Symmetry: C3
Subunit: 213 residues, 3 copies
């Protein structure tokens, strides 16, 4: 369609890890985003799981130009339009539907939607998509399930999210079908609550360095 | 809530912790089985559309055991939904969902609690305004862990897991914030039903309700 | 179906095993097919995963008329029409979509489409289909899923494919709802390279003989 100035592939290839951010207090959003950027992680998935999420996207979009901020847990076109208005550069959804795929592909920012099954992958491909989230990765059957799901589809690429942490993320990054992974461990709720931005920066840098090799 | 439904789907699931999955082969067993379950404290009766007499069983239970909340399970399309609604079903359960079934349900008069296995299926149900779902088949879907992850991004949705749930594991599911109740076939064993062993059915229902307590 | 002279059920009941074929070099297609047929395996799922696949289907159709040759990894109506014109006698898809289901039921050859979940099964049944692939079987929950996924659906029948080999194919073939299984083990990539047609015939013969319950 030509509609997306930012490609979905560019979002997934910026770096190896995309943090799944749950931010309860708005005041934490900008220092958190700066702390991630300082650790070399700069694609920020702010999930629509808290009241302040869209305001957090808006603030990060304005105040942290070194980050590419987007929205996650986007379930429907209403939410897609909200995050587009607020300054999200991309949208992540935990699964897909036709109204969401239609609104996204007609709209101005890339959607990287989750799938669990090949039928869901095929419906996304019918809308021209080739980059997907694999969610919930561990509950979908992990690396092996992803290897089987990805096999008939040489060209498709994934961002697995759900149950991924330093213990297992390399297993996913090793796969030819995987561009990057998502996880909430880079932004733990207790770190945000305690204002331990220093620890967020270290978690980010540990993730980036640990992804190599 | 759904403007066309007089009974909410939520109220169906919050009635009790266990919903028996009923397969009734011979019509004459349906009413005494329903009374036996009610007598054991279990009144939401999922009469599955897996046998020829299922719809007549729903009608019989609706007439003779009006204190039960009788409904239909294994509802696969709008035709079956209309048929069970006409018969007196107070709700419908489906093992999975489709857009024609969702549309017919929301235009019709009784709550549908449809099965999902994945978040995309959940999202399709949510597009139609639904917030109460079955999680089927629960154990083969990846059980409590799967359900935990799937239900994660979806804090308002509630489930009734069904499929491989037993007295051995049902409290594992009932302990989850996202779960209101579970479904199981163990309350109405095929052999008890054919034997007319209603005291056994009552005992099992009573044990299920007591054992659900955390 | 009055549009499908060759029923989906006839394809799946021909034998216990359907090889998932990836043919990288066209010249190997015909002797591979003859080797399978010599070992007693006649239904050949030639997957659309390599450039020469459609030419492989045309070659096998001409030269090995006892092979029942079909196309796999059929993802959309365009590919379905292409393989139909090339002489495929059936099509297999790893999942399903409404455009693919509509095209299949409008066309002349049976589609046996993959499902992973009951909602996907219900969508296929809404188009009148009663035979399905269960893919990727191991990732879908395996035998326990079919005892359960197939539960409320006593009449539906399957061809499980994905992670099935001699170690477990009998576990699937034991099920009332299973007509046959699929797998790539019968045509190992390196056997084709090495021109080891004897190896292919032996694996086929072993698979058919090992299937007797």
């Amino acid at each position: 369609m030509k509609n997306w100035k930012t490609s979905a592939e560019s979002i997934l290839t910026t770096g190896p890890v995309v943090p799944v951010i749950v931010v309860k207090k708005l005041e934490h959003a900008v220092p958190m985003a700066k702390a991630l950027v300082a650790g070399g992680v700069r694609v920020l998935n702010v999930t629509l799981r808290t009241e302040c999420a869209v305001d957090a996207i808006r603030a990060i979009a304005k105040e942290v130009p070194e980050a590419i901020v987007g929205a996650g847990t986007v379930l429907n076109p209403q939410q897609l339009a909200e995050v587009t208005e607020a300054g999200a550069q991309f949208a992540i959804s935990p699964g897909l539907t036709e109204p969401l795929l239609k609104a996204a592909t007609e709209g101005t920012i890339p959607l990287i939607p989750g799938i669990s099954t090949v039928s869901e992958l095929m419906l996304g491909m019918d809308y021209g998509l080739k980059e997907f989230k694999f969610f919930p990765a561990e509950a979908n059957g992990g690396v092996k399930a992803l290897q089987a799901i990805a096999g008939p589809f040489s060209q498709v690429r994934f961002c697995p999210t759900g149950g991924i942490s330093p213990a297992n993320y390399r297993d996913y990054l090793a796969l030819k079908s995987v561009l990057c992974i998502g996880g909430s461990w880079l932004v733990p709720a207790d770190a945000l609550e305690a204002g331990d931005y220093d620890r967020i920066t270290k978690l980010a840098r540990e993730a980036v360095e640990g992804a190599k090799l």
